């Protein structure tokens, strides 16, 4: 199945979807009539092939001269998030689901673009320094201007946790120069190991009913959860608890036996981790209605994640903020103020109980589940929409 969760990052109206299309052919759709013209809310999904010519996009070597057929390397799946500074929660969720990143910078649009920088920062925070950098709108720029842009980018990427991350000049519309990108996908991104015995944990980003308009109820379908595994091969025929729960104010975890564990385009026996998977469960498709299973944790039955509202956070912050042009000073965190705490996939609205030296105690208005220590990206409301302040770990 899908071997490595590779994410796509860039500015809004630059062409992440376009890039995906160029790579795979699989469309992110762009939907709900708002997003048909403009920008997606959900993650965009695509399945790209790597079968190398060693003597590729398709498993045949008729194209690159030598008739010695395309030698199977990998199959990779995309994690394409919204690159808008309003919808950052989704991006954050994607980030602690990904194994590696793909940057997208346009030629004619500037080098210190705010959103892109923010994305980069997020990636750095959430252990995602494996970034393949792509020059995108180069089918517009001069023989000198492009070079200048590249130089500027290089200059920028000197103090960042990205040091010598590779840059490729592609056209997402004209279909050129993606060979290099493909090569890098095997070269610069090795897949981090993901075993059998590391306790099975599924991180849900999407809720899906496949209940088509027109059918009869004597021919029914269950609930499908679109979520990623980063530990534990889920096999067909297992019982599950989804632990952030269902709301009564108290919450109670949801129990579902596996109908299917579906990856690629064809349903499989297994779901080997480091991939984003559509899990058919006996759970109602009415709870998989639109975007209900977003930021929920799934464990195999006989397991104890903990649903915390009162949290011990170890926090770290910036000197100067991101999301804006206008990079504003980080004023100190203020008590009993609504922050957004992004933990793996959750985007919970939290109130500050205490501020110490490097630790903070937080109240959650919506309960999140901590199994391990859990990776956090933090966010705040200063300029209406949510800006990225810093990062944390749950000290548990």
């Amino acid at each position: 199945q899908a071997t490595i969760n590779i994410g796509t990052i860039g500015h809004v109206a630059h062409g992440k979807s376009t890039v995906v299309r160029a790579i795979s052919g699989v469309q992110t759709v762009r939907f709900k009539d708002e997003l048909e013209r403009n920008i997606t809310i959900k993650l965009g999904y695509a399945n790209a092939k790597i079968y190398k010519c060693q003597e590729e996009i398709s498993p045949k070597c008729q194209r690159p001269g030598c008739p010695g057929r395309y030698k199977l390397v990998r199959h990779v799946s995309f994690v394409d998030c919204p690159g808008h500074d309003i919808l950052m929660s989704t991006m954050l969720s994607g980030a602690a689901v990904m194994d590696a990143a793909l940057l997208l910078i346009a030629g004619n649009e500037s080098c210190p673009q705010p959103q892109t920088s923010e994305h980069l920062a997020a990636i750095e925070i959430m252990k995602l320094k494996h970034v393949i950098i792509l020059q995108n709108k180069v089918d517009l720029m001069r023989e000198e201007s492009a070079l200048e842009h590249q130089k500027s980018i290089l200059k920028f990427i000197r103090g960042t946790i990205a040091d010598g991350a590779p840059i490729v000049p592609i056209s997402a519309q004209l279909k050129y120069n993606i060979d290099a990108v493909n090569e890098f996908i095997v070269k610069t991104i090795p897949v981090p190991p993901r075993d059998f015995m590391i306790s099975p944990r599924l991180i849900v980003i999407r809720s899906f009913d496949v209940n088509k308009p027109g059918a009869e109820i004597e021919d029914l379908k269950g609930g499908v959860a679109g979520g990623s595994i980063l530990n534990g091969v889920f096999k067909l025929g297992d019982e599950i608890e989804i632990r952030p729960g269902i709301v009564t104010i108290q919450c109670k975890p949801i129990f579902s036996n596996i109908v299917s564990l579906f990856a690629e385009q064809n349903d499989l026996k297994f779901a080997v981790p480091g991939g984003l998977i559509g899990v058919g469960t006996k759970v109602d498709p009415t709870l998989c209605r639109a975007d209900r299973l977003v930021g929920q944790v799934v464990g195999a039955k006989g397991h104890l994640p903990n649903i915390y509202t009162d949290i011990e956070i170890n926090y770290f912050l910036l000197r100067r903020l991101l999301g804006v042009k206008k990079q504003a000073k980080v004023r100190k965190l203020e008590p009993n103020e609504v922050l957004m705490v992004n933990i793996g996939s959750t985007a919970t609205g939290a109130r500050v109980v205490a501020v110490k030296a490097d630790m903070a105690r937080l109240q959650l208005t919506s309960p999140a589940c901590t199994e391990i220590n859990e990776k956090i990206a933090l966010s705040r409301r200063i300029e209406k929409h949510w800006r990225l302040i810093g990062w944390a770990t749950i000290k548990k």
Binding site: E143, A146, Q150, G164, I167, V168, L174, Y176
Partner: peptide, 17 residues
């Protein structure tokens, strides 16, 4: 490195419509 990139860029420039 931005010089195994330079070659790529050159190639791209060569094969534009």
């Amino acid at each position: 490195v931005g010089l195994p990139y330079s070659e790529l860029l050159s190639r791209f420039f060569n094969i534009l419509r």
